[PDB]
Amino acid sequence: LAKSQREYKLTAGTSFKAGKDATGVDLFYQLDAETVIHKAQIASLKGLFLDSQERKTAAVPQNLTGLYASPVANSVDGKGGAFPQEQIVKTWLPFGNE
Amino acid sequence: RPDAPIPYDPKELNLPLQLERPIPVARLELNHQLLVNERSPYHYFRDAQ
Amino acid sequence: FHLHPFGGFAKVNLAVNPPLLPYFNQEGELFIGLQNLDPPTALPLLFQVAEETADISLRRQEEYKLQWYYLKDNAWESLGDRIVNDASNGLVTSGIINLGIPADISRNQTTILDPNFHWLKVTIPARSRTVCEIIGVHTQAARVTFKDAGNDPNHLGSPLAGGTISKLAVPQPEVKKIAQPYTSFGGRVKEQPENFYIRISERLRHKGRAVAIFDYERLVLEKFPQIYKVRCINHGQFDDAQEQLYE
Amino acid sequence: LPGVNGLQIGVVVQLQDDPNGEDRILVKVPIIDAQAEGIWARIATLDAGNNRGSFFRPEVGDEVILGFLNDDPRDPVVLGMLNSSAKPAPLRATAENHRKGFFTRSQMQLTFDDDKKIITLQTPGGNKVTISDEDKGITLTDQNGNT
Amino acid sequence: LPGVNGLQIGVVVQLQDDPNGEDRILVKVPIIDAQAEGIWARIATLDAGNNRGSFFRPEVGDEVILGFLNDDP
Amino acid sequence: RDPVVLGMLNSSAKPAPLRATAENHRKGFFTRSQMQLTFDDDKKIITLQTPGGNKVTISDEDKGITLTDQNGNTFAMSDRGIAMNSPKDITLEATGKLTLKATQDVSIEGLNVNIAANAQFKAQGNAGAEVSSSAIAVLKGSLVMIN
Amino acid sequence: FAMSDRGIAMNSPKDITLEATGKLTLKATQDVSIEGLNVNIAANAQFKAQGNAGAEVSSSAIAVLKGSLVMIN
């Protein structure tokens, strides 16, 4: 949204332009349901992992062996490393590892 | 000093401890390099009050 | 004071016999911190997922659903009964989860995390390897569908490239930007005579029933176009727990 | 749309609350309608950029000069303010023309004197900073008598 | 009166002694008559108001740009 | 074939340095690197700022002049007089004579005090002169004359 | 006149003066050093100097202690 707005409402059936086709005709997409837009954004992501001896048997942690933390979860190393620029798919682990 | 504090790690940020005036402080933390009977120290203290 | 991960802390009152250390009991946790929230409200969140990276050993059991919480001045509260729709099916496919955010979320006396944000939390008790990997998490998301107005019959044969849609058909000044970060999904073209002949000649032989190697293979390749090759194994069983095949 | 010739006179009505965040000003034209509040116009200035430029804004009632893009009445542009006998200039013009500078609403001044080569900053309370070639030095004067 | 198109070039002749206290300047236009002294014109500036504004004045001989209200010479 | 530039423009894609208000108290010049020369008509303040923290302020609310450095050095003239503060050092040098004078008491303090003259040294009280120490007190010379 | 990361410095080829109608105070958390060709200290009333770990007065030439009445210890 624009800086002077607080909310905005889009109604079902609103149209969007998708360029031209292989024959030179225009393409269009429509909105499926009513939506409302505001100013909320995601600011940070963090992750925590609790290791145990019960992992190999797929049960609840009972005999603990470590607690690991990733303060910047959306990165290569979990703490702010950058992705190689030539990588097509850039994925990360949601909780981390040991 | 709560208005001129020292960070735990000079390479990272932490939240200043909330005191009404300067006091001396001691920190007790668990040792992460130890493993006793293949278990962590936390395994022994999670359930202590 | 309790000393918490990521640099937070908490005050302690000995009259109530608190725990000595902060308490943790679950195998996986993800914390999500948000900016410029105005509760109560509704948050659609888009989870883009890498669908090939999960564990196929066994299906996630019911005792290990995902759990959702929100923060209220160092106390966590459940969100289980305010989720309208989760199109990601528990973080196995890409989709939008629709959360309703109540008015008693708080940020005045938070000390265990950054006090400048509002905080949500997703946890898993066990078998955290059955959760896929993530590509992005976003707010202000919506889904749209193609509508034909006399276009090429070969449009639906290939996905739409990321970054194509950025404009509104009737533009409005209140909206400042539109973005399409990923490709499209789920299209299929109308049948041409040759594929028609292939389908009907195969049906005239297996009659729509599966009794032999030929029948299992052709009934799959026709219904699911996203498969490239398949093989039918006769009198063979697969053991999920051992990852062993019995001949 | 029927067009407009030349430049026009405008009067300022409102400075704030632009419906769009474009930094425009509400101006009316007395020869079209002196009763309506007018339309939003853009300002051309001495310097402007991304978080950059000279920021001076007129006050309600000030007289300005208007031009129009492509001679379209719906696209006014402000080209500068004007003085008159009803709104006098801060200095009287002379044949020697020795004094220049900036004067503000509250009578604070930043001025240059080309006769004696003096640069001075003044506040109406008496606080003054002077760089002078006649005095061959620097002087800081306070309203309390500190020198 | 026959009108004028576009913008023109002017040359300054006198700064002071406006017959009316309006703070105008005497300017001539070389393509109309380079021998006459010209007419009194108004100045648009960066800031102006009641005893307020930026006060910079050209010198005799300086070149300036001229516009006209309602295309009136 | 004869274009002429008449000024620059701001927009939502190139925001102005300040947001417009109904009171309209602040004016000045802002640059690319965020150096400022500004006027405040509400409190009658003139200020020059550099993003590093170096600041010069002429103020009517403070009734004086203030020079502030990014290192903590501070110089001020106000209704209480003149004050100077430095976290490191203060020096004073002259090729002629350095005079200090007051109409009230003069006070000198420090961890150690060293007075050294290349020629005669002289101290004088007109109603009594005192020299003392909590430890040994020493009077030395080539020839010592008491009274 | 300069303020920089080394502190405050003043230099004059001719003279430096300081006058006040109240009290002039000089203070440091380190040593204070005064130099010159001649040093003259003069008070209209009592004059007093004091070291807390020893006080020394000396000269390479004659050293003089004078008064109407001199009391040693």
Residue numbers in the entry:
A (entry chain BH): 297 to 394
B (entry chain BH): 494 to 542
C (entry chain BH): 789 to 1035
D (entry chain EJ): 370 to 516
E (entry chain AJ): 370 to 442
F (entry chain CJ): 443 to 589
G (entry chain AJ): 517 to 589
Sentences from the paper on this structure:
The transition from the inner tube with C6 symmetry to Cis8, the VgrG-like spike with C3 symmetry, was facilitated by Cis5 and Cis7, which formed the first two layers of the inner tube. The cavity of the spike towards the tube lumen was plugged by three copies of Cis6. The highly conserved baseplate component Cis9 linked the lateral baseplate components Cis11 and Cis12 to the first layer of the sheath. Cis11 and Cis12 formed a hexamer of heterodimers surrounding the spike as seen in previously studied CISs. When compared to Afp11/Pvc11, Cis11 harboured three extra domains including an extended carboxy terminus. The second additional Cis11 domain seemed to stabilize interactions with Cis12, whereas the third extra domain composed the cage surrounding the spike, which was observed in the in situ structure. The cage was further surrounded by the crown, consisting of six trimers of Cis19, which are not present in other studied CISs. The wide connector observed in the in situ subtomogram average was composed of an extra domain of the baseplate component Cis12. The amino-terminal domains of Cis13 proteins bound the baseplate while the C termini formed a triple alpha helix extending towards the TM and penetrating it.
Here, we characterized a CIS in the multicellular cyanobacterium Anabaena, with features distinct from extracellular CISs and T6SSs. In contrast to cytoplasmic free-floating eCISs and cytoplasmic membrane-anchored T6SSs, Anabaena CISs are anchored to the TM, which is mediated by modified tail fibres and a baseplate component.
